[PDB]
Scaffold this active site. Structure first.
Site, mmCIF file in Angstrom:
data_model
loop_
_atom_site.group_PDB
_atom_site.id
_atom_site.type_symbol
_atom_site.label_atom_id
_atom_site.label_comp_id
_atom_site.label_asym_id
_atom_site.label_seq_id
_atom_site.Cartn_x
_atom_site.Cartn_y
_atom_site.Cartn_z
ATOM 1 N N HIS A 2 0.836 -1.240 0.000
ATOM 2 C CA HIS A 2 0.000 0.000 0.000
ATOM 3 C C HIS A 2 0.834 1.237 0.000
ATOM 4 N N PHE A 4 0.114 4.213 -0.526
ATOM 5 C CA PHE A 4 -0.459 5.357 0.258
ATOM 6 C C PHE A 4 -0.669 5.006 1.707
ATOM 7 N N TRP A 5 -1.414 3.948 1.971
ATOM 8 C CA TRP A 5 -1.856 3.645 3.328
ATOM 9 C C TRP A 5 -0.695 3.328 4.276
ATOM 10 N N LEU A 159 -16.424 9.256 -0.841
ATOM 11 C CA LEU A 159 -15.202 9.333 -1.648
ATOM 12 C C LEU A 159 -15.516 8.782 -3.033
ATOM 13 N N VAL A 161 -14.068 8.904 -7.304
ATOM 14 C CA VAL A 161 -13.269 9.418 -8.471
ATOM 15 C C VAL A 161 -14.048 8.991 -9.699
ATOM 16 N N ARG A 169 -4.039 7.404 -8.930
ATOM 17 C CA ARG A 169 -3.591 7.915 -7.605
ATOM 18 C C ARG A 169 -4.258 9.205 -7.196
ATOM 19 N N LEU A 170 -5.440 9.536 -7.710
ATOM 20 C CA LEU A 170 -6.159 10.714 -7.343
ATOM 21 C C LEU A 170 -6.820 10.578 -5.925
ATOM 22 N N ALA A 171 -7.229 9.382 -5.559
ATOM 23 C CA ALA A 171 -7.913 9.172 -4.250
ATOM 24 C C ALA A 171 -6.924 9.574 -3.114
ATOM 25 N N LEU A 411 -24.134 6.432 6.790
ATOM 26 C CA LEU A 411 -25.112 6.635 5.673
ATOM 27 C C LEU A 411 -24.488 6.206 4.330
HETATM 28 C C1 LIG Z 1 -8.256 13.721 10.622
HETATM 29 C C2 LIG Z 1 -9.084 13.772 9.356
HETATM 30 C C3 LIG Z 1 -8.686 12.549 8.461
HETATM 31 C C4 LIG Z 1 -9.701 12.541 7.275
HETATM 32 C C5 LIG Z 1 -9.399 11.350 6.296
HETATM 33 C C6 LIG Z 1 -9.626 9.982 6.906
HETATM 34 C C7 LIG Z 1 -9.305 8.908 5.833
HETATM 35 C C8 LIG Z 1 -10.548 8.714 4.913
HETATM 36 C C9 LIG Z 1 -10.208 7.576 3.942
HETATM 37 C C10 LIG Z 1 -11.347 7.525 2.889
HETATM 38 C C11 LIG Z 1 -12.637 6.803 3.409
HETATM 39 C C12 LIG Z 1 -13.671 6.699 2.279
HETATM 40 C C13 LIG Z 1 -15.004 6.107 2.796
HETATM 41 C C14 LIG Z 1 -15.905 5.861 1.562
HETATM 42 O O1 LIG Z 1 -16.393 6.845 1.011
HETATM 43 S S1 LIG Z 1 -16.090 4.253 1.057
HETATM 44 C C15 LIG Z 1 -16.738 4.455 -0.618
HETATM 45 C C16 LIG Z 1 -15.541 4.516 -1.589
HETATM 46 N N1 LIG Z 1 -16.051 4.866 -2.920
HETATM 47 C C17 LIG Z 1 -16.282 4.066 -3.951
HETATM 48 O O2 LIG Z 1 -15.994 2.847 -3.846
HETATM 49 C C18 LIG Z 1 -16.825 4.681 -5.215
HETATM 50 C C19 LIG Z 1 -16.271 3.956 -6.469
HETATM 51 N N2 LIG Z 1 -14.815 3.955 -6.580
HETATM 52 C C20 LIG Z 1 -14.094 5.004 -6.693
HETATM 53 O O3 LIG Z 1 -14.550 6.100 -6.817
HETATM 54 C C21 LIG Z 1 -12.569 4.823 -6.712
HETATM 55 O O4 LIG Z 1 -12.327 3.443 -6.998
HETATM 56 C C22 LIG Z 1 -11.851 5.185 -5.336
HETATM 57 C C23 LIG Z 1 -11.986 6.670 -5.084
HETATM 58 C C24 LIG Z 1 -12.510 4.391 -4.135
HETATM 59 C C25 LIG Z 1 -10.369 4.766 -5.355
HETATM 60 O O5 LIG Z 1 -9.861 5.519 -6.451
HETATM 61 P P1 LIG Z 1 -9.017 4.664 -7.581
HETATM 62 O O6 LIG Z 1 -9.596 3.289 -7.668
HETATM 63 O O7 LIG Z 1 -9.056 5.558 -8.686
HETATM 64 O O8 LIG Z 1 -7.608 4.473 -6.963
HETATM 65 P P2 LIG Z 1 -6.387 5.540 -6.834
HETATM 66 O O9 LIG Z 1 -5.274 5.058 -7.789
HETATM 67 O O10 LIG Z 1 -6.840 6.907 -6.996
HETATM 68 O O11 LIG Z 1 -5.917 5.234 -5.343
HETATM 69 C C26 LIG Z 1 -5.574 3.965 -4.874
HETATM 70 C C27 LIG Z 1 -5.317 4.010 -3.384
HETATM 71 O O12 LIG Z 1 -6.698 4.192 -2.872
HETATM 72 C C28 LIG Z 1 -6.955 3.266 -1.850
HETATM 73 N N3 LIG Z 1 -8.436 3.007 -1.769
HETATM 74 C C29 LIG Z 1 -9.210 2.311 -2.641
HETATM 75 N N4 LIG Z 1 -10.443 2.309 -2.205
HETATM 76 C C30 LIG Z 1 -10.508 3.046 -1.049
HETATM 77 C C31 LIG Z 1 -11.516 3.332 -0.100
HETATM 78 N N5 LIG Z 1 -12.784 2.969 -0.271
HETATM 79 N N6 LIG Z 1 -11.219 4.106 0.913
HETATM 80 C C32 LIG Z 1 -9.918 4.461 1.170
HETATM 81 N N7 LIG Z 1 -8.922 4.210 0.308
HETATM 82 C C33 LIG Z 1 -9.233 3.439 -0.787
HETATM 83 C C34 LIG Z 1 -6.229 2.001 -2.348
HETATM 84 O O13 LIG Z 1 -6.004 1.149 -1.263
HETATM 85 C C35 LIG Z 1 -4.956 2.701 -2.824
HETATM 86 O O14 LIG Z 1 -4.056 2.998 -1.734
HETATM 87 P P3 LIG Z 1 -2.770 2.069 -1.523
HETATM 88 O O15 LIG Z 1 -3.366 0.718 -1.351
HETATM 89 O O16 LIG Z 1 -2.020 2.170 -2.848
HETATM 90 O O17 LIG Z 1 -2.035 2.485 -0.284
HETATM 91 C C1 LIG Z 2 -30.943 -6.178 -2.526
HETATM 92 C C2 LIG Z 2 -29.994 -6.150 -1.345
HETATM 93 O O1 LIG Z 2 -28.815 -5.379 -1.739
HETATM 94 C C3 LIG Z 2 -28.968 -4.007 -1.777
HETATM 95 O O2 LIG Z 2 -30.038 -3.501 -1.529
HETATM 96 C C4 LIG Z 2 -27.811 -3.212 -2.262
HETATM 97 C C5 LIG Z 2 -28.190 -2.125 -3.016
HETATM 98 N N1 LIG Z 2 -27.232 -1.323 -3.517
HETATM 99 C C6 LIG Z 2 -25.916 -1.520 -3.319
HETATM 100 C C7 LIG Z 2 -25.015 -0.612 -3.840
HETATM 101 C C8 LIG Z 2 -23.698 -0.811 -3.626
HETATM 102 C C9 LIG Z 2 -23.168 -1.838 -2.878
HETATM 103 O O3 LIG Z 2 -21.793 -1.915 -2.719
HETATM 104 C C10 LIG Z 2 -21.254 -2.551 -1.502
HETATM 105 C C11 LIG Z 2 -21.114 -1.435 -0.495
HETATM 106 C C12 LIG Z 2 -20.045 -0.576 -0.565
HETATM 107 C C13 LIG Z 2 -19.914 0.498 0.314
HETATM 108 C C14 LIG Z 2 -20.871 0.682 1.297
HETATM 109 N N2 LIG Z 2 -20.828 1.787 2.112
HETATM 110 C C15 LIG Z 2 -19.775 2.759 1.839
HETATM 111 C C16 LIG Z 2 -19.645 3.860 2.917
HETATM 112 N N3 LIG Z 2 -20.942 4.230 3.490
HETATM 113 C C17 LIG Z 2 -21.821 3.172 3.954
HETATM 114 C C18 LIG Z 2 -22.029 2.144 2.861
HETATM 115 N N4 LIG Z 2 -21.903 -0.222 1.398
HETATM 116 C C19 LIG Z 2 -22.071 -1.223 0.527
HETATM 117 C C20 LIG Z 2 -24.018 -2.785 -2.303
HETATM 118 C C21 LIG Z 2 -25.383 -2.622 -2.517
HETATM 119 C C22 LIG Z 2 -26.406 -3.508 -1.972
HETATM 120 S S1 LIG Z 2 -25.781 -4.732 -0.895
HETATM 121 C C23 LIG Z 2 -25.485 -3.797 0.634
HETATM 122 C C24 LIG Z 2 -26.830 -3.418 1.336
HETATM 123 C C25 LIG Z 2 -27.493 -4.675 1.744
HETATM 124 N N5 LIG Z 2 -28.044 -5.665 2.004
HETATM 125 MG MG LIG Z 3 -7.248 7.932 -9.653
#
Ligand SMILES: CCCCCCCCCCCCCC(=O)SCCNC(=O)CCNC(=O)[C@H](O)C(C)(C)COP(=O)(O)OP(=O)(O)OC[C@H]1O[C@@H](n2cnc3c(N)ncnc32)[C@H](O)[C@@H]1OP(=O)(O)O
Ligand SMILES: CCOC(=O)c1cnc2ccc(OCc3ccc(N4CCNCC4)nc3)cc2c1SCCC#N
Ligand SMILES: [Mg+2]
Length: 411
Positions: A2, A4-5, A159, A161, A169-171, A411
């Protein structure tokens, strides 16, 4: 592993997380004055943007980014489609800090390419009960209780992208810039959840779902006449029979929550949340914001008998896009939110949630196995899902805990 992490103040392995005995910060203490005043550098073609969450057009932009690019399940059957009204509610709670909402736009045309959001939360996140036990047997109660006071921290969500910019690497840049903006306000911890496993959760729970419209759940092969229903003469009548619900709530005294209920709901919820190891503390204004009914967004009922609120439940709505299905394009899901029961079994309270949700057109009721959610799974016909939700802190050492010791709904 990782790039980043490994650079960040989080536990780096399960082993590390198994050694942690006390709650507390991971990093060296810092002050606001040590944090850079300038935004993190970004490529000259992009620009940082702080959306105005009270501007319809700004919430629409964020809405469209997430509709088309936010989270899908591991099989790409669903993508969340959080509504604009839900985003306004989730992103603008009492005392929210507009600067904690961080976006990247293409300079040329102002296309929204990425987003992350932070909101305040007051969290109890001191040492858990079973670590505090082991700390009396060690002579060590004072260090174990040092961070018991609820803390004003950041909750991170949304979060995203854009799909065209993935794996560039934008995340990490987004996370770094949000961390800077939160640290500039003298906050040094965050809590966040994800479906994916990252370094390193302090708790993880399965999702559970309860079918309310099994016909539809079938037509969008999530149920698909679940395999176990095959040996039936008639798979669908049996399916509907199994999940049928009453038309109207069973509890004498249930009604929608109204503003004058806020103090009583605050009291009964805070009494119940207290029992868990990690849980939020809400002011009356936060109870109003997160629990008063809002059309299309959040639904809250109380049981009032003899002019006293003794029980309540809430659920909120997140529709999902059904991927690759134009016949049924949308799944209307209800998620269990906070609740408290003092007069009736929890299963009888949440049966009324399912009745209300079904009555209002929801297709499924979902939840994570946090709070006491496991106590009504079997009787109310919830099934374990695919998927889990993992809970994380930033800059906070914390022992591993079971999900039934977590009271923060995310949420
Ligand atoms: C004190 C205040 C602190 C505040 C901040 C607290 C931290 C908050 C942290 C955020 C909490 C978010 C809570 C939610 O919203 S969870 C919901 C996350 N969103 C989605 O899944 C939406 C769909 N996917 C995307 O938009 C992209 O795939 C994302 C943006 C997820 C990654 O973009 P991409 O795929 O274009 O990759 P990259 O090349 O830019 O970056 C790759 C690096 O990103 C690390 N990665 C992948 N997924 C996640 C993930 N869910 N949380 C944390 N990090 C994640 C991955 O391990 C890697 O790091 P490393 O493995 O190389 O080290
Ligand atoms: C019919 C039963 O399934 C659902 O109703 C449903 C609907 N939309 C989605 C959309 C995305 C998804 O991705 C997995 C996921 C990924 C992230 C996440 N978070 C991210 C941060 N905030 C809270 C929820 N929660 C779930 C699962 C789902 C699912 S499965 C998770 C909910 C349940 N059961
Ligand atoms: Mg990226």
């Amino acid at each position: 592993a990782h790039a980043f992490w490994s650079t960040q103040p989080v536990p780096q392995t399960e082993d590390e997380t198994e050694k942690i005995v006390f709650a507390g910060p991971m990093d060296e203490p810092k002050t606001v004055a040590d944090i850079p005043e300038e935004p993190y550098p970004i490529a000259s073609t992009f620009e940082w943007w702080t959306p105005n969450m009270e501007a319809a057009d700004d919430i629409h932009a964020i809405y469209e980014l997430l509709r088309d690019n936010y989270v899908e399940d591991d099989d790409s059957m669903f993508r969340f489609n959080y509504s604009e009204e839900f985003l306004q509610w989730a992103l603008c709670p009492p005392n929210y800090i507009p600067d904690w909402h961080v976006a990247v736009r293409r300079k040329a045309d102002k296309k929204l390419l990425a987003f992350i959001a932070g909101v305040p939360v007051t969290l109890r996140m001191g040492t858990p009960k079973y670590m505090k036990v082991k700390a009396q047997e060690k002579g060590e109660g004072e260090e174990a209780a040092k961070y018991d006071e609820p803390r004003h921290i950041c909750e991170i969500n949304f979060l995203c992208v854009h799909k065209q910019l993935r794996e560039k690497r934008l995340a990490p840049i987004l996370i770094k810039e949000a961390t800077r903006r939160v640290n500039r306000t003298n906050v040094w911890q965050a809590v966040y959840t994800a479906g994916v496993l990252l370094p390193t959760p302090y708790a993880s729970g399965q999702y559970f779902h309860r079918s309310l419209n099994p016909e539809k759940l079938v037509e969008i092969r999530f149920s698909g006449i679940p395999a176990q229903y095959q040996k039936f003469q008639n798979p669908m009548a049996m399916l509907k029979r199994n999940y049928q619900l009453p038309s109207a709530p069973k509890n004498s005294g249930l009604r929608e929550m109204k503003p004058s209920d806020v103090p009583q709901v605050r009291r009964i919820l805070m009494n119940y949340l207290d029992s868990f190891d990690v849980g939020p503390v809400f002011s009356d204004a936060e109870i109003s914001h997160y629990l008063l009914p809002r059309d299309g967004v959040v639904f809250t009922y109380v049981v009032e008998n003899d002019k006293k609120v003794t029980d309540f439940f809430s659920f909120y709505r997140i529709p999902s896009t059904v991927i690759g299905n134009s016949n049924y394009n949308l799944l209307n899901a209800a998620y269990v939110h906070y609740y408290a029961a003092t007069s009736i079994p929890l299963h009888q309270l949440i049966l009324d949630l399912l009745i209300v949700a079904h009555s209002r057109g929801f297709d499924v009721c979902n939840m994570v196995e946090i709070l006491d959610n496991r106590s009504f799974v079997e009787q109310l016909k919830f099934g374990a899902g695919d998927g889990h939700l993992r809970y994380y802190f930033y800059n906070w050492a914390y022992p591993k805990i079971k999900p039934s010791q977590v009271a923060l709904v995310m949420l």
